[PDB]
Every structure is written in C-alpha cells, then in structure tokens.
CSV table of C-alpha atoms in Angstrom, one decimal:
chain,number,residue,atom,x,y,z
A,1,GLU,CA,0.0,0.0,0.0
A,2,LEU,CA,3.0,2.3,-0.5
A,3,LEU,CA,1.7,3.1,-4.0
A,4,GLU,CA,-1.0,5.2,-2.5
A,5,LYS,CA,0.7,8.1,-0.8
A,6,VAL,CA,2.9,9.1,-3.9
A,7,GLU,CA,-0.2,9.1,-6.3
A,8,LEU,CA,-1.6,11.4,-3.6
A,9,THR,CA,1.5,13.5,-3.5
A,10,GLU,CA,0.8,14.0,-7.3
A,11,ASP,CA,-2.9,14.6,-6.8
A,12,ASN,CA,-1.5,17.4,-4.7
A,13,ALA,CA,1.4,18.8,-6.8
A,14,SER,CA,-0.7,18.7,-10.0
A,15,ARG,CA,-3.5,20.6,-8.4
A,16,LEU,CA,-1.2,23.2,-6.9
A,17,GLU,CA,0.1,24.6,-10.2
A,18,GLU,CA,-3.4,25.1,-11.5
A,19,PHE,CA,-4.6,26.7,-8.3
A,20,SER,CA,-1.5,28.9,-8.4
A,21,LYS,CA,-2.5,30.0,-11.9
A,22,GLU,CA,-6.0,30.8,-10.8
A,23,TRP,CA,-4.9,32.7,-7.7
A,24,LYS,CA,-2.3,34.6,-9.8
A,25,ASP,CA,-5.2,35.6,-12.2
A,26,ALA,CA,-7.2,36.7,-9.2
A,27,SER,CA,-4.3,38.7,-7.8
A,28,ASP,CA,-3.7,40.4,-11.2
A,29,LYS,CA,-7.4,41.3,-11.4
A,30,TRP,CA,-7.3,42.8,-7.9
A,31,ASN,CA,-4.2,44.8,-9.1
A,32,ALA,CA,-6.5,46.0,-11.8
A,33,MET,CA,-9.6,47.1,-9.8
A,34,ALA,CA,-7.4,48.4,-7.0
A,35,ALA,CA,-6.0,51.2,-9.2
A,36,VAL,CA,-9.6,51.5,-10.4
A,37,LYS,CA,-11.6,51.4,-7.1
A,38,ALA,CA,-9.8,50.0,-4.1
A,39,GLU,CA,-6.4,51.8,-4.0
A,40,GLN,CA,-6.3,50.6,-0.3
A,41,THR,CA,-4.1,53.7,0.4
A,42,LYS,CA,-4.9,55.0,3.9
A,43,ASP,CA,-4.0,58.7,3.9
A,44,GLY,CA,-5.5,62.1,3.2
A,45,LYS,CA,-2.5,63.1,1.1
A,46,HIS,CA,-4.1,62.5,-2.3
A,47,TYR,CA,-7.7,63.2,-1.3
A,48,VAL,CA,-8.2,59.5,-1.6
A,49,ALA,CA,-8.8,59.7,-5.3
A,50,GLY,CA,-10.9,57.1,-7.1
A,51,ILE,CA,-13.4,55.8,-4.6
A,52,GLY,CA,-13.7,55.3,-0.8
A,53,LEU,CA,-16.4,54.4,1.7
A,54,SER,CA,-15.1,55.4,5.2
A,55,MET,CA,-17.2,54.4,8.2
A,56,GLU,CA,-15.2,56.9,10.2
A,57,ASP,CA,-15.4,57.1,14.0
A,58,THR,CA,-15.0,60.4,15.8
A,59,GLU,CA,-15.5,61.2,19.5
A,60,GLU,CA,-19.1,61.7,18.4
A,61,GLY,CA,-19.2,58.1,17.3
A,62,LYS,CA,-19.6,56.2,14.0
A,63,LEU,CA,-20.3,58.4,11.1
A,64,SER,CA,-20.5,57.3,7.4
A,65,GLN,CA,-18.8,59.0,4.5
A,66,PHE,CA,-18.4,58.3,0.8
A,67,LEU,CA,-15.6,60.0,-1.1
A,68,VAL,CA,-15.2,60.3,-4.8
A,69,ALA,CA,-13.1,62.9,-6.7
A,70,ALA,CA,-14.4,62.3,-10.3
A,71,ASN,CA,-17.9,63.6,-11.1
A,72,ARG,CA,-18.5,62.2,-14.6
A,73,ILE,CA,-22.1,61.4,-13.8
A,74,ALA,CA,-25.3,60.5,-15.8
A,75,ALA,CA,-28.1,59.5,-13.5
A,76,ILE,CA,-31.6,58.1,-13.8
A,77,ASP,CA,-34.3,57.9,-11.2
A,78,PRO,CA,-35.6,54.4,-10.3
A,79,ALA,CA,-38.9,55.3,-8.6
A,80,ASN,CA,-41.8,53.1,-9.8
A,81,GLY,CA,-39.3,51.4,-12.0
A,82,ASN,CA,-38.8,54.6,-14.0
A,83,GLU,CA,-36.2,55.4,-16.6
A,84,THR,CA,-35.8,59.2,-16.6
A,85,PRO,CA,-32.4,60.7,-16.8
A,86,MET,CA,-31.8,63.8,-14.8
A,87,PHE,CA,-28.2,65.2,-15.1
A,88,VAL,CA,-27.4,66.0,-18.7
A,89,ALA,CA,-24.4,68.3,-18.6
A,90,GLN,CA,-26.6,71.2,-19.6
A,91,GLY,CA,-27.1,72.2,-15.9
A,92,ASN,CA,-29.9,69.8,-14.7
A,93,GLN,CA,-33.3,69.3,-16.1
A,94,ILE,CA,-36.1,67.7,-14.2
A,95,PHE,CA,-38.1,70.6,-12.6
A,96,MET,CA,-37.6,73.2,-9.9
A,97,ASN,CA,-39.8,72.6,-6.9
A,98,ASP,CA,-40.2,75.1,-4.0
A,99,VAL,CA,-37.0,77.0,-3.7
A,100,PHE,CA,-35.7,79.7,-1.3
A,101,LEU,CA,-33.5,82.3,-2.9
A,102,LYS,CA,-31.6,85.4,-2.1
A,103,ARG,CA,-29.8,86.1,-5.4
A,104,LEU,CA,-31.2,85.6,-8.9
A,105,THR,CA,-30.2,86.9,-12.4
A,106,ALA,CA,-32.5,86.0,-15.4
A,107,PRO,CA,-33.4,87.9,-18.6
A,108,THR,CA,-36.7,86.1,-19.4
A,109,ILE,CA,-39.6,85.3,-17.1
A,110,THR,CA,-42.8,83.8,-18.4
A,111,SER,CA,-46.3,83.4,-16.8
A,112,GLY,CA,-47.2,80.3,-18.8
A,113,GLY,CA,-49.0,79.0,-21.9
A,114,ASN,CA,-49.1,79.7,-25.6
A,115,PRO,CA,-49.6,83.1,-24.1
A,116,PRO,CA,-48.3,84.2,-20.6
A,117,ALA,CA,-50.4,86.7,-18.8
A,118,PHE,CA,-47.9,88.5,-16.5
A,119,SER,CA,-44.4,88.3,-18.1
A,120,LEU,CA,-41.0,89.8,-17.6
A,121,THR,CA,-39.2,90.3,-20.9
A,122,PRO,CA,-35.4,90.9,-20.9
A,123,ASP,CA,-36.4,94.3,-22.4
A,124,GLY,CA,-38.0,95.1,-19.1
A,125,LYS,CA,-41.6,94.8,-20.2
A,126,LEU,CA,-44.3,93.8,-17.8
A,127,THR,CA,-48.0,93.0,-18.1
A,128,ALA,CA,-50.0,93.0,-14.9
A,129,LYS,CA,-53.5,93.1,-13.5
A,130,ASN,CA,-52.3,95.5,-10.8
A,131,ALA,CA,-49.6,98.1,-9.9
A,132,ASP,CA,-49.7,99.1,-6.2
A,133,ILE,CA,-47.1,101.7,-5.3
A,134,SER,CA,-46.6,103.1,-1.8
A,135,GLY,CA,-43.8,105.4,-3.0
A,136,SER,CA,-42.4,107.1,-6.0
A,137,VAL,CA,-43.6,106.7,-9.6
A,138,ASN,CA,-41.8,108.2,-12.6
A,139,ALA,CA,-43.9,107.4,-15.7
A,140,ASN,CA,-43.0,108.6,-19.2
A,141,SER,CA,-45.7,107.6,-21.7
A,142,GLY,CA,-49.3,106.5,-21.1
A,143,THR,CA,-52.7,105.5,-22.4
A,144,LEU,CA,-54.7,105.4,-19.2
A,145,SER,CA,-58.4,105.1,-18.5
A,146,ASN,CA,-59.3,106.1,-14.9
A,147,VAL,CA,-57.3,108.2,-12.6
A,148,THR,CA,-59.4,108.8,-9.4
A,149,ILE,CA,-58.0,111.8,-7.6
A,150,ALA,CA,-58.8,113.5,-4.3
A,151,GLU,CA,-55.3,114.6,-3.1
A,152,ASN,CA,-52.7,117.3,-4.3
A,153,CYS,CA,-52.9,117.7,-8.2
A,154,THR,CA,-50.2,120.2,-9.3
A,155,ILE,CA,-49.1,120.5,-12.9
A,156,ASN,CA,-45.8,121.7,-14.6
A,157,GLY,CA,-46.3,120.6,-18.2
A,158,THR,CA,-49.6,120.4,-20.2
A,159,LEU,CA,-53.2,119.2,-19.8
A,160,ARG,CA,-55.8,119.0,-22.5
A,161,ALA,CA,-59.1,117.2,-21.8
A,162,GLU,CA,-62.4,117.0,-23.7
A,163,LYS,CA,-64.7,117.7,-20.8
A,164,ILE,CA,-63.7,119.7,-17.7
A,165,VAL,CA,-66.6,120.2,-15.2
A,166,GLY,CA,-66.4,121.6,-11.7
B,1,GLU,CA,12.2,9.2,10.9
B,2,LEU,CA,9.6,6.8,9.4
B,3,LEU,CA,6.2,8.4,8.9
B,4,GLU,CA,7.1,12.1,8.7
B,5,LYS,CA,7.2,12.5,5.0
B,6,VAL,CA,4.3,10.1,4.5
B,7,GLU,CA,2.0,11.8,7.0
B,8,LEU,CA,2.8,15.2,5.5
B,9,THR,CA,1.2,13.9,2.3
B,10,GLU,CA,-2.2,13.2,3.7
B,11,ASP,CA,-2.0,16.4,5.9
B,12,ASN,CA,-1.3,18.4,2.7
B,13,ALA,CA,-4.1,16.7,0.7
B,14,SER,CA,-6.7,17.4,3.5
B,15,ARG,CA,-5.5,21.0,3.9
B,16,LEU,CA,-5.7,21.5,0.1
B,17,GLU,CA,-9.2,20.0,0.0
B,18,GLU,CA,-10.5,22.4,2.7
B,19,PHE,CA,-8.6,25.3,1.2
B,20,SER,CA,-10.1,24.6,-2.2
B,21,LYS,CA,-13.5,24.4,-0.6
B,22,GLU,CA,-13.3,27.8,1.0
B,23,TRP,CA,-11.7,29.2,-2.2
B,24,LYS,CA,-14.6,27.9,-4.3
B,25,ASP,CA,-17.2,29.4,-1.9
B,26,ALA,CA,-15.4,32.7,-1.9
B,27,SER,CA,-14.9,32.7,-5.7
B,28,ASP,CA,-18.6,32.1,-6.2
B,29,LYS,CA,-19.2,35.0,-3.9
B,30,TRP,CA,-17.0,37.3,-6.1
B,31,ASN,CA,-18.8,35.8,-9.1
B,32,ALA,CA,-21.9,37.2,-7.5
B,33,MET,CA,-20.5,40.6,-6.8
B,34,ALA,CA,-19.4,42.0,-10.2
B,35,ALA,CA,-22.4,40.2,-11.8
B,36,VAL,CA,-24.7,42.8,-10.2
B,37,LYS,CA,-22.3,45.3,-8.5
B,38,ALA,CA,-20.5,47.1,-11.3
B,39,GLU,CA,-18.8,44.8,-13.8
B,40,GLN,CA,-15.3,43.5,-14.5
B,41,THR,CA,-13.1,42.1,-17.4
B,42,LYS,CA,-12.5,44.3,-20.5
B,43,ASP,CA,-16.2,44.8,-21.3
B,44,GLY,CA,-16.7,46.8,-24.5
B,45,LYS,CA,-17.7,50.4,-24.7
B,46,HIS,CA,-21.4,49.9,-25.5
B,47,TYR,CA,-23.4,50.0,-22.3
B,48,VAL,CA,-20.8,49.2,-19.6
B,49,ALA,CA,-23.1,50.3,-16.8
B,50,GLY,CA,-21.8,50.0,-13.2
B,51,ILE,CA,-19.1,51.4,-11.1
B,52,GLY,CA,-15.8,51.9,-12.9
B,53,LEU,CA,-13.0,54.4,-13.0
B,54,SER,CA,-10.8,54.6,-16.1
B,55,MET,CA,-7.6,56.7,-16.7
B,56,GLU,CA,-7.4,57.5,-20.4
B,57,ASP,CA,-4.8,59.8,-21.8
B,58,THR,CA,-5.9,62.9,-23.6
B,59,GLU,CA,-4.3,65.8,-25.5
B,60,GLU,CA,-3.9,67.6,-22.1
B,61,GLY,CA,-3.1,64.4,-20.4
B,62,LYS,CA,-4.7,61.8,-18.1
B,63,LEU,CA,-8.5,61.6,-17.6
B,64,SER,CA,-9.8,59.6,-14.7
B,65,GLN,CA,-13.5,59.3,-15.6
B,66,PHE,CA,-15.9,57.6,-13.2
B,67,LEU,CA,-18.9,56.1,-14.8
B,68,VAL,CA,-22.3,55.6,-13.0
B,69,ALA,CA,-25.3,54.6,-15.0
B,70,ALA,CA,-27.3,54.1,-11.9
B,71,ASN,CA,-30.0,55.4,-9.6
B,72,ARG,CA,-31.3,57.4,-6.6
B,73,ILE,CA,-28.7,58.9,-4.3
B,74,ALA,CA,-28.8,60.6,-0.9
B,75,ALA,CA,-25.8,62.4,0.7
B,76,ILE,CA,-25.0,64.3,4.0
B,77,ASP,CA,-22.3,66.7,5.0
B,78,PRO,CA,-19.6,65.0,7.2
B,79,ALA,CA,-17.9,68.3,8.0
B,80,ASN,CA,-16.1,68.0,11.4
B,81,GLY,CA,-19.1,66.4,13.0
B,82,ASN,CA,-22.1,67.5,10.9
B,83,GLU,CA,-25.1,65.3,10.2
B,84,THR,CA,-27.6,67.3,8.2
B,85,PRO,CA,-28.7,65.9,4.8
B,86,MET,CA,-29.2,68.8,2.3
B,87,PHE,CA,-30.0,67.5,-1.3
B,88,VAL,CA,-31.3,64.0,-0.5
B,89,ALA,CA,-33.3,63.1,-3.7
B,90,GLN,CA,-36.5,64.9,-3.4
B,91,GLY,CA,-36.4,67.0,-6.6
B,92,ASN,CA,-34.3,70.1,-5.8
B,93,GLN,CA,-34.9,69.9,-2.1
B,94,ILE,CA,-33.7,72.9,-0.1
B,95,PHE,CA,-32.7,76.0,-2.0
B,96,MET,CA,-30.3,77.5,-4.5
B,97,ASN,CA,-27.2,79.7,-3.8
B,98,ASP,CA,-26.0,82.5,-6.1
B,99,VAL,CA,-27.5,81.4,-9.4
B,100,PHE,CA,-27.8,82.7,-12.9
B,101,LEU,CA,-31.0,81.9,-14.8
B,102,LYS,CA,-32.3,82.3,-18.3
B,103,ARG,CA,-36.0,81.4,-18.6
B,104,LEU,CA,-39.0,80.2,-16.6
B,105,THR,CA,-42.7,79.3,-16.6
B,106,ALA,CA,-44.4,79.6,-13.2
B,107,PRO,CA,-47.8,80.6,-11.7
B,108,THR,CA,-46.8,81.8,-8.2
B,109,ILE,CA,-43.9,83.9,-7.0
B,110,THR,CA,-43.5,85.7,-3.7
B,111,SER,CA,-40.9,87.6,-1.6
B,112,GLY,CA,-40.4,85.4,1.5
B,113,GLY,CA,-41.2,87.2,4.7
B,114,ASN,CA,-42.1,87.3,8.5
B,115,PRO,CA,-44.3,90.3,9.3
B,116,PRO,CA,-43.9,90.5,5.2
B,117,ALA,CA,-44.6,92.2,1.6
B,118,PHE,CA,-44.6,92.2,-2.3
B,119,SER,CA,-45.2,89.3,-4.7
B,120,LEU,CA,-45.7,88.3,-8.3
B,121,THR,CA,-48.8,86.1,-8.2
B,122,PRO,CA,-50.4,84.1,-11.0
B,123,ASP,CA,-53.1,86.8,-11.3
B,124,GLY,CA,-50.7,89.6,-12.3
B,125,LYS,CA,-50.9,91.1,-8.8
B,126,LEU,CA,-47.9,93.2,-7.8
B,127,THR,CA,-47.4,95.7,-5.0
B,128,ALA,CA,-44.2,97.3,-6.1
B,129,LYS,CA,-43.4,100.2,-3.9
B,130,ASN,CA,-41.6,102.1,-6.8
B,131,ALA,CA,-42.9,101.4,-10.3
B,132,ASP,CA,-40.6,103.5,-12.4
B,133,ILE,CA,-41.5,103.3,-16.1
B,134,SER,CA,-39.5,104.9,-19.0
B,135,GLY,CA,-41.7,103.7,-21.8
B,136,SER,CA,-45.3,102.9,-23.0
B,137,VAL,CA,-48.1,102.2,-20.6
B,138,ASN,CA,-51.6,100.8,-21.1
B,139,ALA,CA,-53.6,101.5,-17.9
B,140,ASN,CA,-57.3,100.8,-17.6
B,141,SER,CA,-57.7,101.8,-14.0
B,142,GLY,CA,-55.8,103.8,-11.4
B,143,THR,CA,-56.1,106.0,-8.3
B,144,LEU,CA,-53.5,108.8,-8.2
B,145,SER,CA,-53.1,111.0,-5.2
B,146,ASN,CA,-50.2,113.5,-5.9
B,147,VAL,CA,-50.3,114.2,-9.6
B,148,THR,CA,-47.1,115.6,-11.1
B,149,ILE,CA,-48.0,116.4,-14.7
B,150,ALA,CA,-44.5,117.0,-16.0
B,151,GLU,CA,-44.8,117.1,-19.8
B,152,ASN,CA,-47.6,117.3,-22.4
B,153,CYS,CA,-50.6,115.3,-21.3
B,154,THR,CA,-54.0,114.7,-22.8
B,155,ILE,CA,-57.4,113.3,-21.8
B,156,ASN,CA,-59.8,111.3,-23.9
B,157,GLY,CA,-62.3,110.2,-21.3
B,158,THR,CA,-63.0,113.1,-19.0
B,159,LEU,CA,-61.6,115.3,-16.1
B,160,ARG,CA,-63.7,116.9,-13.3
B,161,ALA,CA,-61.9,118.7,-10.5
B,162,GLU,CA,-63.4,120.6,-7.5
B,163,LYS,CA,-60.4,122.9,-7.6
B,164,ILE,CA,-59.0,124.9,-10.6
B,165,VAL,CA,-56.0,127.1,-11.1
B,166,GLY,CA,-55.8,129.2,-14.2
C,1,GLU,CA,15.9,10.3,-8.2
C,2,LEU,CA,13.0,9.0,-6.2
C,3,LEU,CA,13.7,11.5,-3.4
C,4,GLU,CA,12.2,14.1,-5.7
C,5,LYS,CA,8.7,12.8,-5.1
C,6,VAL,CA,9.4,12.6,-1.3
C,7,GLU,CA,10.8,16.1,-1.5
C,8,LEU,CA,7.7,17.1,-3.5
C,9,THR,CA,5.5,16.7,-0.4
C,10,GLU,CA,7.5,19.1,1.8
C,11,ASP,CA,7.9,21.5,-1.1
C,12,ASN,CA,4.1,21.4,-1.3
C,13,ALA,CA,3.9,22.0,2.4
C,14,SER,CA,6.0,25.2,2.1
C,15,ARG,CA,4.0,26.3,-0.9
C,16,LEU,CA,0.8,25.9,1.1
C,17,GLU,CA,2.3,27.9,3.9
C,18,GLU,CA,2.9,30.7,1.5
C,19,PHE,CA,-0.5,30.4,-0.2
C,20,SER,CA,-2.3,30.3,3.2
C,21,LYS,CA,-0.3,33.4,4.2
C,22,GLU,CA,-1.4,35.3,1.1
C,23,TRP,CA,-4.9,34.0,1.0
C,24,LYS,CA,-5.9,34.7,4.6
C,25,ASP,CA,-4.3,38.1,4.2
C,26,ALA,CA,-6.6,38.8,1.2
C,27,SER,CA,-9.6,37.4,2.9
C,28,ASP,CA,-9.0,39.5,6.0
C,29,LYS,CA,-8.7,42.6,3.8
C,30,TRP,CA,-12.1,41.7,2.1
C,31,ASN,CA,-13.7,41.1,5.5
C,32,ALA,CA,-12.5,44.5,6.5
C,33,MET,CA,-14.1,46.0,3.4
C,34,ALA,CA,-17.3,44.0,4.1
C,35,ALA,CA,-18.7,46.4,6.7
C,36,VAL,CA,-16.7,49.2,5.0
C,37,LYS,CA,-17.3,48.8,1.3
C,38,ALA,CA,-17.6,45.1,0.2
C,39,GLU,CA,-21.0,44.5,1.8
C,40,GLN,CA,-20.6,40.8,1.2
C,41,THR,CA,-23.2,39.9,3.8
C,42,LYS,CA,-26.9,40.1,2.9
C,43,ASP,CA,-29.1,43.1,3.7
C,44,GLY,CA,-32.6,41.9,4.2
C,45,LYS,CA,-35.8,43.9,3.7
C,46,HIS,CA,-35.1,47.6,3.8
C,47,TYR,CA,-31.9,47.7,6.0
C,48,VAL,CA,-28.9,48.7,3.9
C,49,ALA,CA,-25.6,50.4,4.6
C,50,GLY,CA,-22.7,51.0,2.2
C,51,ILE,CA,-22.7,50.4,-1.5
C,52,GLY,CA,-24.1,48.0,-4.1
C,53,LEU,CA,-25.6,47.9,-7.6
C,54,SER,CA,-28.5,45.5,-7.4
C,55,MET,CA,-30.1,44.6,-10.7
C,56,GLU,CA,-33.3,43.1,-9.2
C,57,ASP,CA,-35.7,41.0,-11.2
C,58,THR,CA,-39.2,42.4,-11.6
C,59,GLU,CA,-42.4,41.4,-13.4
C,60,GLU,CA,-41.3,43.9,-16.1
C,61,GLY,CA,-37.8,42.4,-16.2
C,62,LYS,CA,-34.7,44.3,-15.2
C,63,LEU,CA,-34.5,46.9,-12.5
C,64,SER,CA,-31.0,48.2,-11.6
C,65,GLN,CA,-30.8,50.1,-8.4
C,66,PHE,CA,-28.1,52.0,-6.5
C,67,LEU,CA,-28.0,53.4,-3.0
C,68,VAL,CA,-25.6,55.6,-1.2
C,69,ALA,CA,-25.9,56.4,2.5
C,70,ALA,CA,-24.0,59.8,2.4
C,71,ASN,CA,-21.3,61.3,0.2
C,72,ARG,CA,-19.8,64.5,-1.3
C,73,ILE,CA,-19.0,64.6,-5.0
C,74,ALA,CA,-16.4,66.5,-7.1
C,75,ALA,CA,-17.0,68.5,-10.2
C,76,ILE,CA,-15.9,67.2,-13.6
C,77,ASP,CA,-18.4,67.0,-16.4
C,78,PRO,CA,-18.3,64.1,-19.0
C,79,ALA,CA,-16.8,66.8,-21.4
C,80,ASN,CA,-14.5,64.3,-23.0
C,81,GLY,CA,-11.2,66.0,-24.0
C,82,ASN,CA,-11.9,68.8,-21.6
C,83,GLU,CA,-11.7,69.6,-17.9
C,84,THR,CA,-15.0,71.1,-16.6
C,85,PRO,CA,-15.3,72.0,-12.9
C,86,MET,CA,-19.1,71.9,-12.9
C,87,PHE,CA,-21.4,71.0,-10.0
C,88,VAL,CA,-18.9,71.5,-7.2
C,89,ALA,CA,-21.9,71.5,-4.8
C,90,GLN,CA,-20.1,74.1,-2.7
C,91,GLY,CA,-22.2,76.5,-0.7
C,92,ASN,CA,-25.2,74.5,-2.0
C,93,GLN,CA,-24.6,75.8,-5.5
C,94,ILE,CA,-24.8,74.0,-8.8
C,95,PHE,CA,-25.7,76.5,-11.6
C,96,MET,CA,-29.2,76.3,-13.2
C,97,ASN,CA,-30.1,76.2,-16.9
C,98,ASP,CA,-33.4,76.8,-18.6
C,99,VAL,CA,-36.1,75.3,-16.4
C,100,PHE,CA,-39.8,75.7,-15.5
C,101,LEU,CA,-40.9,76.7,-12.0
C,102,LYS,CA,-43.9,76.3,-9.6
C,103,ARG,CA,-43.0,78.0,-6.3
C,104,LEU,CA,-40.4,80.7,-5.9
C,105,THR,CA,-39.0,82.7,-3.0
C,106,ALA,CA,-36.4,85.4,-3.9
C,107,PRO,CA,-36.3,88.9,-2.4
C,108,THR,CA,-33.5,89.7,-4.9
C,109,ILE,CA,-34.0,89.4,-8.7
C,110,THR,CA,-31.9,90.9,-11.5
C,111,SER,CA,-32.4,91.5,-15.2
C,112,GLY,CA,-30.0,88.9,-16.5
C,113,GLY,CA,-27.4,91.3,-17.8
C,114,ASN,CA,-24.4,93.4,-16.9
C,115,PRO,CA,-26.5,95.9,-15.0
C,116,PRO,CA,-30.0,95.1,-13.7
C,117,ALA,CA,-32.2,96.9,-16.2
C,118,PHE,CA,-35.3,95.7,-14.3
C,119,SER,CA,-34.7,94.8,-10.7
C,120,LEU,CA,-36.6,93.3,-7.8
C,121,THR,CA,-35.3,94.0,-4.3
C,122,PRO,CA,-36.3,93.3,-0.7
C,123,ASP,CA,-37.3,97.0,-0.9
C,124,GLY,CA,-39.9,95.8,-3.4
C,125,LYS,CA,-39.1,98.4,-6.2
C,126,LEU,CA,-39.2,97.9,-10.0
C,127,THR,CA,-37.4,100.1,-12.5
C,128,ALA,CA,-39.3,98.7,-15.5
C,129,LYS,CA,-40.0,100.3,-18.8
C,130,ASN,CA,-43.6,99.2,-19.5
C,131,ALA,CA,-46.2,98.2,-17.0
C,132,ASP,CA,-49.7,97.9,-18.6
C,133,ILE,CA,-52.6,97.0,-16.2
C,134,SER,CA,-56.1,95.9,-17.1
C,135,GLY,CA,-57.1,96.0,-13.5
C,136,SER,CA,-56.7,98.0,-10.3
C,137,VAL,CA,-53.8,100.5,-9.9
C,138,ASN,CA,-53.0,102.4,-6.7
C,139,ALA,CA,-50.2,104.9,-7.5
C,140,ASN,CA,-49.9,107.3,-4.6
C,141,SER,CA,-47.0,109.6,-5.6
C,142,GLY,CA,-46.2,109.9,-9.3
C,143,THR,CA,-45.5,112.0,-12.3
C,144,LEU,CA,-47.0,111.7,-15.8
C,145,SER,CA,-45.2,113.1,-18.9
C,146,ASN,CA,-46.8,112.0,-22.2
C,147,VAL,CA,-50.1,110.6,-21.1
C,148,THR,CA,-53.6,110.4,-22.7
C,149,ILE,CA,-56.4,109.9,-20.3
C,150,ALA,CA,-58.9,107.7,-22.0
C,151,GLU,CA,-61.7,107.3,-19.4
C,152,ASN,CA,-63.1,109.0,-16.3
C,153,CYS,CA,-61.0,111.2,-14.1
C,154,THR,CA,-62.3,113.0,-10.9
C,155,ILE,CA,-60.3,115.2,-8.5
C,156,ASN,CA,-61.4,116.2,-5.0
C,157,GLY,CA,-58.0,117.7,-4.3
C,158,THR,CA,-56.3,120.8,-5.6
C,159,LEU,CA,-56.0,121.3,-9.3
C,160,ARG,CA,-53.1,123.4,-10.7
C,161,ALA,CA,-53.2,122.5,-14.4
C,162,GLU,CA,-50.7,124.3,-16.6
C,163,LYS,CA,-53.4,124.9,-19.2
C,164,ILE,CA,-57.0,124.1,-20.0
C,165,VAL,CA,-58.2,123.3,-23.5
C,166,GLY,CA,-61.9,122.8,-24.4
C-alpha cells in the first residue's frame, strides 16, 4: 500500500500549479480594480482619489462617509421602475420645486401658456393686473383710462381734456 | 524518521481539500459581486453600466473618468461632525445659492417674509413700492393722489376737479 | 531520483504555507471591506448600509438600483477631452439652466445682464419700462409726462393744471 501516498503526492502537486495560476489571475485582477476602485491607500494626502467608503469614527461616534473625486455622472431615477435621466451636462433638467433664494439673475420670465399673462421680458416689459405703489412713480408715456384723484394735483407741463366740469 | 514524509502527504491533501472548498465558496461570492455590483473584465464600450474608473490619456493628459449609469442617491455633510442631509433626492430639495437663470414658466412667485410684503402672483398682482417706467403704458384703471403732470398730457375720457387754477 | 517525489510533499507544504499566508491576508482585507465597502453579507428587507448595484428582477424584467448612505462629490463633467469643474456643490450651488418653476421665493431678482435693467429688491421696487394694467392700480405719488387719459377722471384735491383746452 506504498503506491498510494505518492499518487496522492501527485494529486497534490498537480492541483497546486493550476490553483496557483487561478490565484495569480485573481491577484492580477485585484491589481486592476485596486488602481480602479480599491487603492487601499490609507492617507489624506491625495484626497483618496478614485473611490472610498469610510465608516469613520469620531469622538461623536460612528459616522458614514463616501468620497469620490471624479464627477462624470449621468443619473436616472428608479422610482416606480422609472427610466428618466436627470443630469445631462446642460445644468440639470427635471423641474424646480419650491426654492428659497436670495440672489437671482435672469433675462426672461414667463407666466405660462401659448400666451403668458404676466411676463418679464429681458427688455424690461411687464404685463400685470395691478400696480400698487406706496412710494415714487416716474412714468413717461401712457394710455390710461381712470385716474381717481382726491389729493394734491399740481401741474408743470400740459393738460388738454375734452370735458372739464367743476 | 519513518512516517514524517508520509503523513505530510495526507495532511497536505486534506488541507488542500478544505482550502479549495473555501476558495470555491469565496470565488462564487465574487462571481456574485461583479455580476450585479459594477462589472469587470474588459467589457466593450457599448453599455458598460456599473461602477468603474478609467484613466485614459488625452491631449492635455490623463483623464480619470468615473462612470455611474445608476439610480437614486442621498448624501449628507460629514464636516467635522455634521449630520444634516441637504439635497437628498426629493427634486431640488432645499434651495439655491447665487444662481444665474435664463427662462422660466411659473404661476406663483412671492418675496419670502415674517411680518412680510410684495409678490408676483399668478393673477398679475404686484405691490411694487416704486414702479418706475420709462416707456409705454396701457392702464385701464388707477387712483393717483399726488399728480405731477410734467410734460404734455391729454385726456380722452374726462376730467372733473373741484379745484381749478388758471 | 525517487527522493524528488518525497521532496515534493514538503515542497508542497512550504508552498501551502505561502498560499495560506497570502490567502488569509486577502480574505482579512475583504472582510475589513465587508462592513466598510464590500457588503458581502446580505441586507434583508429595507436595511442597507454601504454600496451595491442591485439589478433586481421584476415582473417587467430588469431593475438596476443603486443606493448611497451619504457622500460628497467632485466637479468634472463628461466633457471628453476637456476639464470642466461643474457641480462643485459648494455653498449649495450647482448652476441652473433653462427650467420651469412652480414655487419661488427670492427677495432679490436681477435683469440677467451686466446691470439690472429691471430689478426686484427686498425693498420691493421695480425700474421697469412698460407696465400695462387691465385691473386695479394704486399709485400714490407719481409723475406723468406723455399721457392720454382715455376714461373718467375725478379730482377732489387741488387742481393746478398748466393749461385748459376745451
């Protein structure tokens, strides 16, 4: 029964080279994705470029963090199994919901529809159903219907009506 | 020494068997990871969805692009012990900083105020405390207290004043 | 000669020592990433922490899904062949393109040009150039240069017209 162990020794030696080849392939593949994703470099010297998912602990406690320095994004929302992209590089396009603001700069503003009612052209035009002023008004031209007056009415230029009664 | 080399044979063989078992289990687990999570190999550039960073040379030089054809995200600020999510996937959640704009289409616009003030409502309404105009006007109603008729005026409808100077 | 096969067993033993070294090293690394980034363990129901691209089966077929607990992204557009620092997400700023709107809140609004030709301020003023109103107007203090008065006008206050024609 000597014949057994040596055949075994072979059943071993023969399997080791092939396993070595497989593990070498795996190690090379890890060398690939490591420079891709898992650089396994523990430092803040290169901003941890690539990708990182640090479950970092402070004196506060465990706090999650995900670090990527490459934007290169093109997203789609999955809600209801939907397939709508949202970040074409032309500065977002889904819709603007309720937004708080303190600085805006826009030439064109539209009320809505084949025709907007109250609009704000870059030319400075404005259509409205009201103009309430609690202060100064400097008007230049005008085609006006009713001007109800009961307070100071002093004139420096010209006035020419059709009927003047009083 | 009698059995030492012989026993090493079976010890090896058994250790290889178990080592191969754990390797097969783990390798199947990896086979499961890139199958769904990102991809691997040298997959062509047709759809290549999943997590992947590639450093391709350009005219300027390297380009480490990071591709994500994927879905809803939510992120928080980890700043030195901060825990407040800000833009967590609710369709432009909180607010915009200094922003330039081009065009819009909106029913309702306000100011934003505690004991508060002016707004641009869907129905043209505006209480603008200083409505300076340097061009044409088409008014169909108005109540003017202190009239400063500066240049040549005219009336098509009628004027009727209790007072008169001239 | 024969001593090669006997030597073969102990050579295999040393080779297994080396392979066990490397393999348990790698497995320990992956186990470290498991709660960090690998997420080898299952999630169950809704609990989820970390990363993973799950292409779940649905009655309609494929449903890829991605989930991030918390992150902070950099700013490089697809912009192949160009470096584009866009969407830094600093100070909650992205830059907005053409878009609709439903609800707005902005005390400060500009004309979308080098100066603000028409401006909205927390003071509530408006230096426009045309404001036509088909409804109510309440202008307290104002001047009128080239105006035609197309409907009724009544004064209960003082009247100091420059001239009267009729």
